[PDB]
Design a protein around this ligand. Structure first.
Ligand code: NA
Ligand code: NA
Lengths: 4, 240, 240, 4
């Protein structure tokens, strides 16, 4: 999971 | 003939319309923006999903801010007379009101202004859908245990996340929002009005996803998409 | 029993819930804000409309920014366990993200934060509706001839106007948006899901209203409301 | 007609  | 209702957009034009997918994965080193691992999964899922809805899909990868503006201006100057609707999906880094080209930012307003009722006449009165998988800020949701028309009418903004908040993307599975959107379109596009589909998307994202991170700041976080509707009719992707 | 669906909010609690109506008409001279002629029409229309939906309506007039924050904090600390939902209507001057008390501004975020899923536990999982008749800027629409859930989940913001735009109020008839909202609730609340009602509101405001002004800058202008939905289920004001 |  990563943020944009 | 008999009594007629006009509560839903006319979706039986010869064409459903264009689906423009802007998939920005790799960013110019000088911007300092990271690569968006997993976004190709999103772009492929969207292409297949909207193909099955009979949209003319055009996938574009790694566009500069200049290329994004030129593409959207060019698309808005096409003749959409035979098309029921218009869809644009933006997959990129972002901030509130902003989407990033590979070399710098673009105001969302600049993109959507090309399609205003007064600036794209062959889409006047037709639904213009902007689906945005991008951050809207840096907030994290820690969750809780359980004769004229307006020129801004007939737009729908399907935001991946609430105003002010990060948006989550899984490097293996794709973004939470796009994953859920395609699954709900696949299952319900022949059955439900579009606002009801997007509400199922909201519930899927809100209930089935939670971040896992080695970093306590980013661990166990949640997400709710935000439907911003300026539509004036119900939208069904099928017709009678 | 037989198969069960859970696509709609449970609206058969003993009470529908509170409807808080904040009606700011007269502003402290030092703010320089004008009186909002016609807003009492709106407040009376809303009171009757939501009374017929069986909400416990509380009308509040001419609140300072301090009184607004205190009222919303107090309401959020009530026990809403027996209530299906919560509704708050704000009638005032405003800007993007801001509503005015009689003596100065209040961040909309400050008001709605009291009702977050983690801060008002007896409304967790229940729809929280914020209906906002206020400007969101100074743009004018010239029209065209034709286990955890997110803490921000289960909010619906029924904005009177698009982001960045003025909102129109008639001194005799009330505001375009509130007029149309009450008429569509009266006609369709026993028949349509709430997003579909608000879409009819969008169409009514977009098609039936156009400003008349002696000032060319403000003449012949149009308006589209903006539905911002973070809801996770369908919302019907009736139950089976 | 007036604005808010
Ligand atoms: Na997402
Ligand atoms: Na209005």
């Amino acid at each position: 999971d990563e943020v944009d | 003939s008999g009594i007629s209702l006009d509560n839903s957009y006319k979706m039986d034009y010869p064409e459903m319309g264009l689906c423009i997918i802007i998939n920005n994965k790799n960013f110019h080193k000088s911007t300092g923006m990271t690569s968006r691992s997993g976004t190709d999964v999103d772009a492929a899922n969207l292409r297949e999903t909207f193909r099955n809805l009979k949209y003319e899909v055009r996938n574009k990868n790694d566009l500069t801010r200049e290329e994004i503006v030129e593409l959207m201006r060019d698309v808005s100057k096409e003749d959409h007379s035979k098309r029921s609707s218009f869809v644009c999906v933006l997959l990129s880094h972002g901030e509130e009101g902003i989407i990033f080209g590979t070399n710098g930012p673009v105001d969302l307003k600049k993109i959507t202004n090309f399609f205003r009722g007064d600036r794209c006449r062959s889409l006047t009165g037709k639904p213009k859908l902007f689906i945005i998988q991008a951050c809207r800020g840096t907030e994290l949701d820690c969750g809780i245990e359980t004769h004229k028309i307006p020129v801004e009418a007939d737009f729908l903004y399907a935001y991946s996340t609430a105003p002010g908040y990060y948006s989550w993307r899984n490097s293996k599975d794709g973004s939470w929002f796009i994953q859920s959107l395609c699954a709900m379109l696949k299952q319900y596009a022949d059955k439900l009005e579009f606002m009801h589909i997007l509400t199922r998307v909201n519930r899927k994202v809100a209930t089935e996803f939670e971040s896992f991170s080695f970093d306590a700041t980013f661990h166990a976080k949640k997400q709710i998409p935000c439907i911003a509707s300026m539509l004036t009719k119900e939208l069904y992707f099928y017709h009678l």
